[PDB]
Design a protein around this ligand. Structure first.
Ligand SMILES: Nc1ccn([C@H]2C[C@H](O)[C@@H](COP(=O)(O)OP(=O)(O)OP(=O)(O)O)O2)c(=O)n1
Ligand SMILES: [Ca+2]
Lengths: 411, 974, 399
DNA sequence: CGAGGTATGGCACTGGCCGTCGTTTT
DNA sequence: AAAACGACGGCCAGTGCCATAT
């Protein structure tokens, strides 16, 4: 199909990792793949930063939270989830005649009630820290907790565990505004997903119900093989809060205007791994003139592209060009622009091949310094979007890029 | 009685006797025989119809001896004090301007010898008032000047004298001009040029409780006396089509031109720098004297204009009803709450979001287009080949190494090496060059770097730009689009081998041949305009809904949406790209056009202290909300017909499922404890024309076939004349309204058939033309009889023509004279269609005046606690107290009845058919909307008014339900 | 101690007072940090990333999973996952019970996985594939930051977030590359320390003879290991890829050689606590370095019309946020408590400056500004504020 | 001899006139 | 060293087409 090329490119430029076999669709979706390469790590970091900026930075009632990766203590029986135990204790238990006849079959109950499990959702820690975070805003009822972290899920040795990077937000609100807040957050999250998308129509939403009859909204990305869930919204209500803090319900309330009412919980959970995959597929864009301009390139958003600038050297006196490129690279890093130091790479390919390599890596701009840059302050610039060359004075370069990215947010 | 000689149900015995007397002369034998013959000729005779239920009511006393005298007395009672104040103004004697203007903030009165004294407010019965506002500072009024008999007044804004870092961005009643007297006498009159704008800046006008103060506009009186049509306005200017005697007695609405026309004298100089539009507050502070002097000059000019105008207006509209109608029409009022602000946000963001999806989709294409520059490949593109593929030149003047600790030098040695090289400003011009490398067409779409609103990429591109269709590779029936300078947009059909930077005709022929695989010209349409030189092709104009004369300015016009659905118009990328772009365009067109006005609406928020007690105690009251008002800036008479004119509220669209921001009118929400009660006149102008024809022909209702037909049928059964036409032709009822009214006012058969082909997609040219021909022949037959004579509506056309051809045309009902610039002596046979339409349109204006007078009289009679909310031509809406709302429901109905009888009285008919006796249904609601049932779903608010805002359904009640809820009474407690 | 009380009172540490303790924090089994602790740790990680990875062409990020499947070495100290699905099958059939259940323990090693003890193993696994990113230029590094699980003596589980750098270098200059790093890392800790003396370095010897260095911070109770550098040679690389060593070669001196591996591992939680103690050295004020303080400025309102001051403060809030300055919106309470208590609360939170918008700001734009360190009040024009703040940051970065 | 009418306003484009500033003549 | 002599944007007004209402 047409999706083989995308995976091949992601493997060549180190977006993904591992062998071709390990990178099947099932492994990617489940989360049991080997992992991502450095470019994938940077892309995920950029996406996480954008999510944090859109969800946490510009709101007065949002705070971070950190939930551990395991659930210790007693658990309900029969869940059949993995358990945490140290190999140092795998022999001393049975040593010296500890009911060594048939009770070791009932030891499974011990396995059920002697070890914890791996964190499966970020919601539990947020519910635990609800009470602690209530003290920040003098119990002002509308307030949220946001987190990003890895979670473990069983997948069907015959079964394994898949790891998924997920971003979770829990919003405590007045019960009366629960549905309005649900609609508001649905619209806002859908807008955020569409913002970076080249084709924001491929993202879609749907309504959903279940046994409890609680309203829900779900967000899907249209991969070439079909719609895949990327984010969900649940209007849980207050059952979980009561169950975690039963009996003395009076402590659970918060201020809604002049009233003091029990909060309603709205939960949103997006998958950052699926988000990165969806954005890669969108960027690759899996019309007579379009077919005639089949350039392989990932049009990742400027706010999301792992690498911004590529810097190299032109033919001439190597020492002076190297010194000026060192200065330029240090300045670009100092202002806060990631740079690919191509000036340190040996010459083995022409300009066209280098441009192709940088396009596959999705680098916004290519900066070139030559003898003319010592003769005068002008350097060559090339833009990924247009492939058009330009001349620019070095002194202003730091500003221009800072403007470009800064304006990419508000296009 | 109960039935007329033509078996048409009339007003019941009780109401008919209460309205008409027995003195009416029964029509003679000849008239009845002519009516019967006419009805038999058209097949309308011998068809009984089920009568409607009778209505029994005892109306309030009607003064005088008949309807006309009663209406005259009511209008005189309403309008006496304001006329007294105007007459007091006419005799005003004032000294010259003060030697110097005062600097204090507030109101200062200037006495003789130039002395200035501070006063709380002008203590006058009448004034000539003008306000100047610093636009850059927002909307808070800056200064003002007023003149009264024997006194000058100057008003200075507190923000003008004091210096503060910031001011409140939300308007309050505390920062507006105080221009009303607390509880000589009452009913002050305010005069000025464009008086609605001045009214908008008065603190006391926004109070929910009504005020006596009324306003007269010199512009409205100019329109009434010597107004000019839009075409006349355009032709009068540029005078620096075959008759010109009207120019010497008319002028445009600008104050200087009106002053020159009415008093002549030395011209009026302008302020050269336009500081109130261009300058900042400091400019006003430094140039205070000149600005105040110019304001005084304008006020004095307006005073002279009013003095010279009033007698002519009194002469040309002698009927007292017109003056009171204008006075009551000049006091529009709209309520709003905090939701309005949310609306402003909700639309704008939504707009942006859609505008983000659209531009993005275009921008990417632009980014992908630049590659065509390589190898000059653009020469092969059948769309972008004709663009500027320029290339400007940049302009100049004239081993295993180890680690180290000495890198601290390597750092600075590098940094300094850079710091030197950045000093090379020798060869760079002071003015930065603009993207020379990029092609010129791409450069045009990129904002300049020094622009404060700069964004990356070609962010300037939009659908309305002539390049956007080129980028999208739009196609019409397999033919690419093209733009001819003379003939607008069209498409290119390849194959012109007689030569009919050059066109790549091969790249078009190949594309069309490929397209044909999925199904001297050989195609039919607007025809080949050979003057457009494009070798290898013919250029065909895109069909326009208004005929071949017009030129298409953009393929993305809403009317082209069905063609996308059918697939005639396609996009090169395929899929939903083209349809999605057109859907976005249709969704956002209204907001794109009107957001500047809507977001800039002057909204004043009333503090809790000043709000009515009925709201502060209502169960539905909401603390922490906002309760403000908007006063529409209505020109009382901005047209020849004397209709009201305003930029915003006479153009606001009705709520629609898809149109973004269409819920504008829905944001006009009554405060808790208040309701909106109103109604629309059913088939107003059609009935007016029918009754005019009936009065002309034989003085009997229904004597003419058109009058017979208009009375029959019911709106609810879809059997009214509009619905009958809609079902006969197969379109919506609104399209039927347009179809009928076009023909009524002289629309040709080509217009009718083109309109039919626009809506009924099943029809072709042949069927639509045949339908139009038959309908025109039936409605009005031949125009000649000696080698309009025949037809159902012939008498109506003859009557309208006769009224228009009169040496001094007057309204048949109230007798208002047409503007001097359109009397036959001054225009002979020019502007004939406008003059003919003026009869009916001014009749509708008189209907509006009569309805307003009747509503005011009924509210005053029984101390009803309601007020006039707004009027849109025939639509009327009133804000009422909820407890009294039901009473209002009857007050409207009776008014309609009166307005129906009075109209007939001046026509010589002493009866009124039962069909048009009452409204179809009076509407009671919490917000303004076309119908109560609609919840106003929109992309701006998909959940509708019921969930997001909580506004429930309204209710429409007919006469019988109103009577039941009122028992026929109108007293406070029955 | 008072420091832990302040941390608990200002949402640096989570969990009830019964839970927080020195041992739990050191081992990594504590409930977790609060939002302020999360922000401080994020700032520390960002500073470390900028110092180590940003300004070097030969350092790249790497992603290592939190667990390793498949057969594993038996009989050791490390967390393992007990079979999950097997818990659904054994409850319907018994395999004769009795003394063959010992083999069940063996069956654990047949299927059970293991969590992540360190980032070194993931980096080593990546080494072969990631060497292609530098055209086999032997001297280069891989950096990562991640959580690791450690048994604590039923065994408890402790979670420690750590930053790891794996440096592959030619054997000859490796011993020189070690000391180099030993300097920079040691300098890095000193960069943000009010008392750089308390950070120290020591030399250590391995039983195999390979030398290394350990970095210690002097907490009041004693010197605690915050970071460690080990020179390991080629032992791990050979062990992880037994057999043909050809693929382990790298081009140094224009010849093939098997690189030596240096491991640098620093505990970010221990570093967090060390900086908390360092910056806490006659009032309870936490003088966290400006580059590390989670909250820069606090915004409030004075006495007067609430709407105007709230609008102005919201505008200033957006302006400061857009420039990368973290702001705590204290203007939603409208000074319901005394001003000195507010100053003390913000000092405990380590906020650099407190800005008070007053009615006079509407007249002329003057605003009251108080500093965390000097504690001297000043009047400043609001428009200036933003720029000034930025400078006060950048200057601190340079000096 | 035959026309729909009355209003409002938006953006896109084009022609012309004017103020910088950097080549060219004194 | 003074100052013509031009190109090259800014800016404004005027025209055309489209979108709303009744
Ligand atoms: N396209 C239009 C719409 C309206 N009008 C004029 C004449 C109409 O009589 C008047 C009011 O039209 P409505 O929309 O109020 O229509 P009616 O009053 O005729 O119909 P209804 O029974 O729906 O009120 O506006 C017109 O000339 N052309
Ligand atoms: Ca109507």
């Amino acid at each position: 199909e047409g999706s083989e090329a995308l995976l091949e490119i992601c493997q060549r430029r180190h977006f993904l990792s591992g062998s071709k076999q390990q990178l099947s669709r099932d492994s990617l979706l489940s989360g049991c793949h080997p992992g991502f390469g450095p470019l994938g790590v940077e892309l995920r970091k950029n996406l996480a930063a954008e999510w944090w900026t859109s969800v946490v930075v510009f709101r007065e009632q949002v705070f971070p939270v950190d939930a551990l990766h395991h659930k210790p203590g007693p658990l309900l029986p029969g869940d059949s989830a993995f358990r945490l135990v140290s190999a140092e204790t795998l022999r001393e238990i049975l040593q010296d005649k500890e009911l060594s006849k048939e009770q070791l079959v009932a030891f499974l109950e011990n396995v059920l009630k002697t070890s914890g499990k791996l964190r499966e959702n970020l919601l539990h820690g947020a519910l635990e820290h609800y009470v602690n975070c209530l003290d920040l805003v003098n119990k002002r009822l509308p307030y949220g907790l946001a987190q990003i972290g890895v979670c473990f899920h069983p997948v069907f040795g015959v079964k394994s565990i898949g790891e998924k990077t997920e971003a979770s937000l829990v919003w405590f609100t007045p019960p009366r505004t629960s549905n309005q807040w649900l609609d508001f957050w649905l619209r806002h999250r859908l807008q955020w997903w569409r913002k970076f998308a080249m084709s924001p129509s491929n993202f879609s939403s749907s309504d959903c119900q279940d046994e409890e009859g609680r309203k829900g909204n779900k967000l899907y990305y249209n991969f070439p093989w079909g719609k895949e869930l990327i984010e969900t919204l649940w209007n849980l209500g207050d059952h979980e809060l009561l169950h975690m803090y039963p009996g003395n319900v009076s402590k659970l309330h918060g201020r809604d205007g002049r009233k003091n009412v029990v909060p309603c919980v709205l939960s949103v959970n997006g998958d950052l791994d699926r988000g990165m995959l969806a954005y890669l597929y969108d960027s690759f864009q899996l019309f007579t003139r379009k077919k005639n301009l089949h350039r392989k390139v990932l049009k990742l958003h400027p706010c999301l592209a792992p690498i911004k600038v590529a810097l190299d050297v032109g033919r001439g006196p190597t020492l002076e060009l190297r010194q000026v490129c060192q200065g330029l690279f240090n300045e670009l890093l100092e202002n806060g622009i990631s740079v690919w130091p191509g000036y340190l790479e040996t010459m083995q390919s022409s300009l066209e091949q280098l441009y192709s390599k940088y396009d596959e890596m999705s680098i916004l701009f290519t900066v070139l310094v030559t003898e003319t840059t010592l003769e005068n302050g002008l350097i060559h610039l090339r833009s990924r979007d247009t492939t058009m060359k330009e001349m620019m004075h070095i002194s202003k370069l730091k500003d221009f890029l800072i403007k470009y990215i800064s304006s990419a947010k508000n296009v | 009685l109960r039935h007329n000689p033509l078996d048409i149900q009339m007003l019941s015995r009780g109401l008919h006797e209460q309205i008409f007397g027995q003195g009416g002369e029964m029509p003679g034998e000849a008239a009845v025989r002519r009516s019967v013959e006419h009805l038999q000729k058209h097949g309308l005779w011998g068809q009984p119809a089920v009568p409607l239920p009778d209505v029994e009511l005892r109306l309030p006393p009607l003064y005088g001896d008949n309807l006309d005298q009663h209406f005259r007395l009511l209008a005189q009672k309403q309008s006496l004090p304001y006329l007294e104040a105007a007459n007091l103004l006419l005799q005003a004697q004032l000294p010259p301007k003060p030697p110097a203007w005062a600097w204090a903030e507030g109101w200062t009165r200037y006495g003789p010898e130039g002395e200035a004294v501070p006063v709380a407010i002008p203590e006058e019965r009448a004034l000539v008032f003008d306000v100047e506002v610093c636009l850059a500072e927002g909307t808070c009024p800056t200064l003002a000047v007023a003149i009264s008999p024997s006194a000058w007044y100057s008003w200075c804004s507190q923000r003008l004298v004091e210096e503060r870092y910031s001011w409140t961005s939300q308007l309050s009643p505390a920062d507006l001009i105080p221009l009303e007297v607390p509880t000589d006498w009452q009913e002050q009159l305010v005069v000025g040029h464009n008086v609605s704008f001045d009214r908008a800046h008065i603190r006391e006008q926004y109070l929910i409780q009504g005020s006596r103060m009324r306003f007269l506009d010199t512009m409205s009186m100019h329109m009434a006396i010597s107004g000019l049509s839009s075409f006349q306005r355009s032709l009068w200017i540029a005078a620096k089509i075959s008759s010109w005697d009207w120019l010497d007695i008319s002028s445009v609405n600008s104050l200087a031109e009106v002053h020159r026309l009415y008093v002549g004298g030395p011209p009026l100089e302008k302020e050269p720098r336009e500081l109130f539009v261009k300058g900042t507050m400091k400019d006003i502070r430094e140039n205070f004297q000149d600005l105040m002097q110019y304001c005084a000059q304008d006020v004095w000019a307006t005073h002279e204009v009013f003095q010279q105008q009033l007698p002519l207006f009194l002469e040309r509209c002698p009927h007292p009803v017109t003056l009171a109608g204008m006075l009551e029409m000049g006091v529009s009022y709209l309520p709003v709450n905090q939701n309005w602000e949310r609306y402003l946000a909700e639309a704008q963001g939504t707009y942006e979001e859609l505008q983000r999806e659209m531009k993005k989709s275009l921008m990417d294409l632009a980014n992908d287009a630049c590659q065509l520059l390589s190898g000059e490949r653009y020469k092969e593109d059948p769309w972008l080949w004709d663009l500027e593929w320029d290339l400007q030149e940049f302009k100049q003047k004239k081993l295993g190494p180890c680690s180290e600790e000495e890198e601290f030098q390597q750092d600075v040695m590098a940094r300094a090496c850079l710091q030197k090289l950045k000093g090379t400003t020798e060869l760079l011009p002071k003015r930065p060059q603009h993207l020379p490398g990029h092609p010129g067409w791409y450069r045009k779409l990129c904002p300049r770097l020094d622009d404060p609103a700069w964004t990356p990429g070609p962010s300037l591109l939009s659908l309305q730009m002539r390049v956007t269709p080129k980028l999208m590779a739009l196609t019409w029936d397999g033919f690419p689009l093209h733009y001819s300078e003379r003939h607008g947009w069209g498409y290119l059909v390849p194959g012109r081998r007689d030569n009919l930077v050059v066109c790549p005709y091969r790249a078009i022929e190949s594309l069309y041949r490929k397209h044909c695989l999925e199904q001297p010209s050989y195609h039919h349409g607007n025809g080949p305009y050979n003057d457009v030189d494009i070798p290898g092709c013919w250029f065909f104009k895109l069909p326009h809904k208004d005929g071949n004369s017009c030129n298409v300015g953009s393929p993305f016009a809403k009317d082209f949406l069905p063609k996308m659905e059918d697939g005639t118009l396609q996009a090169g990328p395929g899929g939903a790209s083209g349809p999605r772009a057109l859907e976005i365009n249709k969704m956002i067109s209204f907001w794109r056009n009107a957001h500047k006005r809507i977001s800039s609406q002057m909204v004043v928020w009333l503090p809790r202290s000043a709000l009515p007690r009925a709201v502060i105690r209502h169960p539905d009251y909401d603390e922490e909300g906002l309760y403000g008002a908007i006063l529409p800036q209505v020109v009382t008479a901005g047209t020849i017909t004397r209709r009201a004119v305003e930029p915003t509220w006479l153009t606001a669209s009705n709520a629609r499922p898809d149109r973004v921001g269409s819920e504008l009118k829905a944001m006009v929400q009554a405060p808790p404890g208040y309701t909106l009660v109103g109604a629309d006149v059913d088939s107003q102008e059609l009935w007016i024309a029918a009754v005019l024809g009936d009065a002309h022909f034989a003085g009997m209702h229904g004597c003419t076939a058109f009058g017979w037909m208009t009375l029959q049928g019911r709106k609810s059964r879809g059997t009214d004349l509009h619905s009958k036409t809609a079902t006969t032709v197969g379109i919506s009822r609104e399209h039927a309204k347009i179809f009928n009214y076009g023909r009524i006012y002289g629309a040709g058969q080509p217009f009718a058939e083109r309109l039919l082909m626009q809506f009924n997609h099943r029809l072709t040219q042949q069927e639509a033309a045949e339908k139009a021909q038959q309908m025109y022949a039936a409605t009005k037959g031949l125009r000649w009889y000696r080698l309009w004579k025949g037809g159902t509506e012939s008498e109506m056309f003859n009557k309208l023509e006769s009224i228009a051809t009169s040496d001094i045309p007057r309204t048949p009902v109230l007798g208002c004279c047409i503007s001097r610039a359109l009397e036959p002596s001054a225009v002979q046979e020019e502007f004939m269609t406008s003059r003919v339409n003026w009869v009916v349109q001014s009749s509708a204006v008189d209907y509006l005046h009569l309805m307003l007078v009747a509503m005011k009289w009924l509210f005053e009679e029984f101390a009803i606690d309601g007020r006039f909310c707004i009027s849109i031509h025939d639509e009327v809406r009133y804000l009422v107290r909820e407890e009294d709302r039901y009473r209002a429901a009857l007050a409207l109905q009776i008014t309609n009845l009166l307005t129906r009888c009075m109209f007939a009285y001046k026509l010589g008919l002493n009866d009124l058919p039962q069909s048009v006796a009452f409204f179809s249904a009076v509407d009671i609601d919490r917000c303004l909307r076309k119908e109560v049932t609609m919840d106003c779903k929109t992309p701006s608010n998909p959940t509708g008014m019921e969930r997001r805002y909580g506004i429930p359904q309204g209710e429409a009640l007919d006469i019988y339900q109103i009577i039941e809820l009122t028992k026929g009474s109108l007293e406070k407690r029955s």
